[PDB]
Amino acid sequence: HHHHHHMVHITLDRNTANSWLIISKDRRQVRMGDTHQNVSDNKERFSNYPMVLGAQRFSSGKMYWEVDVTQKEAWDLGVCRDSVQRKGQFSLSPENGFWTIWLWQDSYEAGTSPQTTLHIQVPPCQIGIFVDYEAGVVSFYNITDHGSLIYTFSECVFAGPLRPFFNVGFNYSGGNAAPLKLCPL
Ligand SMILES: Cc1c([C@@H](C)NS(C)(=O)=O)cnn1C
């Protein structure tokens, strides 16, 4: 792809983080802690899952960023509406305001309803995310495999400002402690 020139500097919004997350000083990395991280509760925090939002809000234009997923067993990545539900149980779907892909149990899937199987020959260590607000497109690229396309959501109905979306996943297995990292431009 040739989307690299729309690169944006994403930082994580601490206030939105699940209370077990640990965000680095530079707000560019996030991992699952082994306990509650001693923060107060607020209406922004994702309560049921290890999720956090980017601080940036996008309502126009073309945006691109990259995320490192090295050695993780489970994660979700993409964008979501600023107005998504924070509390309780919900599924990742465009109807609920999410445009995402994930890794779970050795398979990659797009967060449609129902979910769509992805066809990835080279397991990615870094993912590129491209948003074209006006076109209604969210695309995912395999940076490990020369930028090959993973998935395109088209005909998106964003219906609001968009925020970068992250889920570091649970670590019930002891094999999913590694962080998500926003990669340098
Ligand atoms: C839902 C959950 C957590 C984190 C992600 N949520 S919480 C309770 O900190 O809001 C840890 N164990 N469980 C079962």
Side-chain angles (χ1 to χ4, degrees), residues 1-184:
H1 67 84
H2 299 293
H3 297 310
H4 304 93
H5 60 110
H6 300 296
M7 182 72 81
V8 291
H9 185 79
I10 301 305
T11 60
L12 297 172
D13 184 345
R14 302 184 161 285
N15 284 338
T16 69
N18 176 275
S19 61
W20 285 47
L21 297 182
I22 302 170
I23 292 167
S24 62
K25 180 155 51 176
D26 66 3
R27 300 186 309 108
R28 299 276 284 172
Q29 310 192 17
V30 58
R31 68 187 180 88
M32 187 53 157
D34 287 329
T35 193
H36 186 293
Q37 294 304 131
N38 205 28
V39 294
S40 58
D41 190 40
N42 69 53
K43 61 190 194 182
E44 303 179 69
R45 297 199 184 291
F46 285 100
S47 63
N48 287 43
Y49 314 105
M51 292 167 181
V52 62
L53 302 185
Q56 290 74 34
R57 283 50 149 13
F58 303 121
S59 284
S60 69
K62 296 174 173 180
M63 287 69 58
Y64 180 75
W65 63 97
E66 294 179 353
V67 185
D68 195 298
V69 299
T70 300
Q71 65 145 141
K72 293 190 66 57
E73 295 175 347
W75 49 261
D76 317 322
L77 287 174
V79 292
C80 66
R81 299 187 183 138
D82 62 353
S83 57
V84 294
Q85 179 186 344
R86 307 305 169 85
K87 307 304 182 179
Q89 299 170 91
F90 54 88
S91 58
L92 298 177
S93 63
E95 304 99 280
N96 289 339
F98 300 90
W99 298 267
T100 64
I101 67 170
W102 65 73
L103 172 61
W104 169 246
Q105 298 191 167
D106 201 35
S107 74
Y108 299 94
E109 299 174 319
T112 55
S113 180
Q115 72 269 26
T116 301
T117 297
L118 302 174
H119 301 96
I120 298 183
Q121 174 61 29
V122 176
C125 299
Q126 300 89 34
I127 302 290
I129 302 174
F130 175 68
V131 179
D132 182 337
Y133 197 100
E134 277 72 27
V137 167
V138 183
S139 295
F140 297 83
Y141 297 93
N142 185 341
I143 304 315
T144 307
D145 183 43
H146 310 279
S148 57
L149 182 67
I150 295 170
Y151 193 81
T152 292
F153 294 87
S154 69
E155 314 191 272
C156 298
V157 178
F158 296 135
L162 292 174
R163 298 184 69 179
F165 175 80
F166 309 86
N167 187 356
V168 300
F170 293 101
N171 187 28
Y172 293 109
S173 64
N176 198 36
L180 295 173
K181 308 185 187 177
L182 283 154
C183 307

PDB file of all heavy atoms in Angstrom, residues 131-149:
ATOM      1  N   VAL A 131      -7.721   4.679   7.886  1.00  0.00           N
ATOM      2  CA  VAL A 131      -9.112   5.188   7.938  1.00  0.00           C
ATOM      3  C   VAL A 131      -9.244   6.297   6.896  1.00  0.00           C
ATOM      4  O   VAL A 131      -8.474   7.262   6.918  1.00  0.00           O
ATOM      5  CB  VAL A 131      -9.490   5.688   9.333  1.00  0.00           C
ATOM      6  CG1 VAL A 131     -10.910   6.227   9.338  1.00  0.00           C
ATOM      7  CG2 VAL A 131      -9.306   4.597  10.391  1.00  0.00           C
ATOM      8  N   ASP A 132     -10.231   6.141   6.030  1.00  0.00           N
ATOM      9  CA  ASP A 132     -10.653   7.238   5.113  1.00  0.00           C
ATOM     10  C   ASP A 132     -12.058   7.638   5.545  1.00  0.00           C
ATOM     11  O   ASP A 132     -13.030   6.928   5.272  1.00  0.00           O
ATOM     12  CB  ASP A 132     -10.573   6.838   3.658  1.00  0.00           C
ATOM     13  CG  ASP A 132     -10.943   7.937   2.651  1.00  0.00           C
ATOM     14  OD1 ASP A 132     -11.667   8.886   3.038  1.00  0.00           O
ATOM     15  OD2 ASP A 132     -10.445   7.786   1.508  1.00  0.00           O
ATOM     16  N   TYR A 133     -12.146   8.740   6.290  1.00  0.00           N
ATOM     17  CA  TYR A 133     -13.431   9.139   6.903  1.00  0.00           C
ATOM     18  C   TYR A 133     -14.508   9.393   5.838  1.00  0.00           C
ATOM     19  O   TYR A 133     -15.567   8.833   5.852  1.00  0.00           O
ATOM     20  CB  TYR A 133     -13.285  10.355   7.831  1.00  0.00           C
ATOM     21  CG  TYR A 133     -14.480  10.501   8.753  1.00  0.00           C
ATOM     22  CD1 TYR A 133     -14.422  10.063  10.076  1.00  0.00           C
ATOM     23  CD2 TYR A 133     -15.706  10.964   8.297  1.00  0.00           C
ATOM     24  CE1 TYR A 133     -15.526  10.098  10.908  1.00  0.00           C
ATOM     25  CE2 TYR A 133     -16.818  11.009   9.112  1.00  0.00           C
ATOM     26  CZ  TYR A 133     -16.750  10.553  10.441  1.00  0.00           C
ATOM     27  OH  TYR A 133     -17.850  10.568  11.232  1.00  0.00           O
ATOM     28  N   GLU A 134     -14.145  10.177   4.847  1.00  0.00           N
ATOM     29  CA  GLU A 134     -15.129  10.603   3.819  1.00  0.00           C
ATOM     30  C   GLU A 134     -15.568   9.400   3.008  1.00  0.00           C
ATOM     31  O   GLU A 134     -16.788   9.263   2.762  1.00  0.00           O
ATOM     32  CB  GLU A 134     -14.589  11.717   2.942  1.00  0.00           C
ATOM     33  CG  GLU A 134     -14.788  13.088   3.633  1.00  0.00           C
ATOM     34  CD  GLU A 134     -13.886  13.325   4.798  1.00  0.00           C
ATOM     35  OE1 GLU A 134     -12.770  12.729   4.825  1.00  0.00           O
ATOM     36  OE2 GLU A 134     -14.229  14.103   5.635  1.00  0.00           O
ATOM     37  N   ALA A 135     -14.669   8.497   2.627  1.00  0.00           N
ATOM     38  CA  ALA A 135     -14.994   7.312   1.837  1.00  0.00           C
ATOM     39  C   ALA A 135     -15.770   6.268   2.657  1.00  0.00           C
ATOM     40  O   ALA A 135     -16.390   5.371   2.056  1.00  0.00           O
ATOM     41  CB  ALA A 135     -13.748   6.706   1.234  1.00  0.00           C
ATOM     42  N   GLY A 136     -15.729   6.290   3.986  1.00  0.00           N
ATOM     43  CA  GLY A 136     -16.316   5.250   4.825  1.00  0.00           C
ATOM     44  C   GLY A 136     -15.523   3.930   4.727  1.00  0.00           C
ATOM     45  O   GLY A 136     -16.143   2.893   4.522  1.00  0.00           O
ATOM     46  N   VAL A 137     -14.202   4.019   4.858  1.00  0.00           N
ATOM     47  CA  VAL A 137     -13.307   2.826   4.729  1.00  0.00           C
ATOM     48  C   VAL A 137     -12.421   2.714   5.958  1.00  0.00           C
ATOM     49  O   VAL A 137     -11.797   3.706   6.366  1.00  0.00           O
ATOM     50  CB  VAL A 137     -12.449   2.978   3.458  1.00  0.00           C
ATOM     51  CG1 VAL A 137     -11.290   1.956   3.423  1.00  0.00           C
ATOM     52  CG2 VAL A 137     -13.359   2.874   2.239  1.00  0.00           C
ATOM     53  N   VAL A 138     -12.285   1.470   6.427  1.00  0.00           N
ATOM     54  CA  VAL A 138     -11.238   1.095   7.424  1.00  0.00           C
ATOM     55  C   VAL A 138     -10.503  -0.133   6.856  1.00  0.00           C
ATOM     56  O   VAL A 138     -11.160  -1.176   6.647  1.00  0.00           O
ATOM     57  CB  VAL A 138     -11.847   0.773   8.799  1.00  0.00           C
ATOM     58  CG1 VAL A 138     -10.735   0.463   9.811  1.00  0.00           C
ATOM     59  CG2 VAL A 138     -12.726   1.907   9.302  1.00  0.00           C
ATOM     60  N   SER A 139      -9.202  -0.027   6.664  1.00  0.00           N
ATOM     61  CA  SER A 139      -8.406  -1.138   6.107  1.00  0.00           C
ATOM     62  C   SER A 139      -7.253  -1.479   7.054  1.00  0.00           C
ATOM     63  O   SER A 139      -6.708  -0.642   7.715  1.00  0.00           O
ATOM     64  CB  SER A 139      -7.875  -0.817   4.712  1.00  0.00           C
ATOM     65  OG  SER A 139      -8.940  -0.676   3.769  1.00  0.00           O
ATOM     66  N   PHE A 140      -6.880  -2.754   6.986  1.00  0.00           N
ATOM     67  CA  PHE A 140      -5.853  -3.372   7.837  1.00  0.00           C
ATOM     68  C   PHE A 140      -4.819  -4.000   6.915  1.00  0.00           C
ATOM     69  O   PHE A 140      -5.180  -4.772   6.002  1.00  0.00           O
ATOM     70  CB  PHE A 140      -6.465  -4.425   8.791  1.00  0.00           C
ATOM     71  CG  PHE A 140      -7.455  -3.836   9.764  1.00  0.00           C
ATOM     72  CD1 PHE A 140      -8.787  -3.619   9.402  1.00  0.00           C
ATOM     73  CD2 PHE A 140      -7.063  -3.526  11.064  1.00  0.00           C
ATOM     74  CE1 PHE A 140      -9.667  -3.016  10.291  1.00  0.00           C
ATOM     75  CE2 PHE A 140      -7.974  -2.933  11.942  1.00  0.00           C
ATOM     76  CZ  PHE A 140      -9.282  -2.718  11.572  1.00  0.00           C
ATOM     77  N   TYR A 141      -3.549  -3.826   7.271  1.00  0.00           N
ATOM     78  CA  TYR A 141      -2.390  -4.252   6.445  1.00  0.00           C
ATOM     79  C   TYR A 141      -1.428  -5.048   7.327  1.00  0.00           C
ATOM     80  O   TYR A 141      -1.131  -4.714   8.494  1.00  0.00           O
ATOM     81  CB  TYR A 141      -1.721  -3.048   5.786  1.00  0.00           C
ATOM     82  CG  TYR A 141      -2.625  -2.332   4.817  1.00  0.00           C
ATOM     83  CD1 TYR A 141      -3.387  -1.258   5.242  1.00  0.00           C
ATOM     84  CD2 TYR A 141      -2.815  -2.779   3.517  1.00  0.00           C
ATOM     85  CE1 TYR A 141      -4.281  -0.627   4.398  1.00  0.00           C
ATOM     86  CE2 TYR A 141      -3.726  -2.170   2.663  1.00  0.00           C
ATOM     87  CZ  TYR A 141      -4.437  -1.068   3.094  1.00  0.00           C
ATOM     88  OH  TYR A 141      -5.347  -0.478   2.243  1.00  0.00           O
ATOM     89  N   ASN A 142      -0.796  -6.033   6.697  1.00  0.00           N
ATOM     90  CA  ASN A 142       0.198  -6.931   7.352  1.00  0.00           C
ATOM     91  C   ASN A 142       1.586  -6.345   7.095  1.00  0.00           C
ATOM     92  O   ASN A 142       2.169  -6.602   5.974  1.00  0.00           O
ATOM     93  CB  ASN A 142       0.044  -8.340   6.786  1.00  0.00           C
ATOM     94  CG  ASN A 142       0.932  -9.359   7.474  1.00  0.00           C
ATOM     95  OD1 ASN A 142       1.917  -8.962   8.121  1.00  0.00           O
ATOM     96  ND2 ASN A 142       0.562 -10.598   7.368  1.00  0.00           N
ATOM     97  N   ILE A 143       2.189  -5.611   8.022  1.00  0.00           N
ATOM     98  CA  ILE A 143       3.472  -4.918   7.768  1.00  0.00           C
ATOM     99  C   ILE A 143       4.573  -5.985   7.644  1.00  0.00           C
ATOM    100  O   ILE A 143       5.523  -5.747   6.883  1.00  0.00           O
ATOM    101  CB  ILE A 143       3.732  -3.902   8.889  1.00  0.00           C
ATOM    102  CG1 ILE A 143       2.578  -2.891   9.039  1.00  0.00           C
ATOM    103  CG2 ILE A 143       5.068  -3.192   8.724  1.00  0.00           C
ATOM    104  CD1 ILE A 143       2.090  -2.328   7.737  1.00  0.00           C
ATOM    105  N   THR A 144       4.470  -7.093   8.352  1.00  0.00           N
ATOM    106  CA  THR A 144       5.470  -8.206   8.334  1.00  0.00           C
ATOM    107  C   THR A 144       5.516  -8.783   6.922  1.00  0.00           C
ATOM    108  O   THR A 144       6.627  -9.157   6.473  1.00  0.00           O
ATOM    109  CB  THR A 144       5.081  -9.249   9.386  1.00  0.00           C
ATOM    110  OG1 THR A 144       4.903  -8.597  10.640  1.00  0.00           O
ATOM    111  CG2 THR A 144       6.133 -10.325   9.538  1.00  0.00           C
ATOM    112  N   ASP A 145       4.394  -8.850   6.213  1.00  0.00           N
ATOM    113  CA  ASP A 145       4.309  -9.400   4.833  1.00  0.00           C
ATOM    114  C   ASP A 145       4.234  -8.280   3.782  1.00  0.00           C
ATOM    115  O   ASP A 145       3.294  -8.289   2.981  1.00  0.00           O
ATOM    116  CB  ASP A 145       3.170 -10.380   4.787  1.00  0.00           C
ATOM    117  CG  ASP A 145       3.018 -11.065   3.456  1.00  0.00           C
ATOM    118  OD1 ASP A 145       4.070 -11.461   2.877  1.00  0.00           O
ATOM    119  OD2 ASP A 145       1.871 -11.177   3.021  1.00  0.00           O
ATOM    120  N   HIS A 146       5.153  -7.331   3.811  1.00  0.00           N
ATOM    121  CA  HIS A 146       5.308  -6.307   2.741  1.00  0.00           C
ATOM    122  C   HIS A 146       4.003  -5.511   2.604  1.00  0.00           C
ATOM    123  O   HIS A 146       3.711  -5.035   1.508  1.00  0.00           O
ATOM    124  CB  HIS A 146       5.627  -6.921   1.361  1.00  0.00           C
ATOM    125  CG  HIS A 146       6.738  -7.920   1.294  1.00  0.00           C
ATOM    126  ND1 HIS A 146       8.066  -7.546   1.241  1.00  0.00           N
ATOM    127  CD2 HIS A 146       6.713  -9.267   1.184  1.00  0.00           C
ATOM    128  CE1 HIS A 146       8.824  -8.623   1.150  1.00  0.00           C
ATOM    129  NE2 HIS A 146       8.015  -9.698   1.111  1.00  0.00           N
ATOM    130  N   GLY A 147       3.261  -5.301   3.689  1.00  0.00           N
ATOM    131  CA  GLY A 147       2.069  -4.433   3.640  1.00  0.00           C
ATOM    132  C   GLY A 147       0.870  -5.081   2.996  1.00  0.00           C
ATOM    133  O   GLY A 147       0.010  -4.330   2.560  1.00  0.00           O
ATOM    134  N   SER A 148       0.793  -6.384   2.880  1.00  0.00           N
ATOM    135  CA  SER A 148      -0.333  -7.044   2.190  1.00  0.00           C
ATOM    136  C   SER A 148      -1.661  -6.723   2.892  1.00  0.00           C
ATOM    137  O   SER A 148      -1.739  -6.645   4.157  1.00  0.00           O
ATOM    138  CB  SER A 148      -0.106  -8.544   2.096  1.00  0.00           C
ATOM    139  OG  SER A 148       0.096  -9.168   3.357  1.00  0.00           O
ATOM    140  N   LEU A 149      -2.736  -6.632   2.142  1.00  0.00           N
ATOM    141  CA  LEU A 149      -4.087  -6.373   2.701  1.00  0.00           C
ATOM    142  C   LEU A 149      -4.553  -7.546   3.548  1.00  0.00           C
ATOM    143  O   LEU A 149      -4.520  -8.737   3.117  1.00  0.00           O
ATOM    144  CB  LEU A 149      -5.073  -6.122   1.558  1.00  0.00           C
ATOM    145  CG  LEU A 149      -6.511  -5.793   1.999  1.00  0.00           C
ATOM    146  CD1 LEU A 149      -6.613  -4.458   2.709  1.00  0.00           C
ATOM    147  CD2 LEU A 149      -7.428  -5.759   0.755  1.00  0.00           C
TER     148      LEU A 149
END
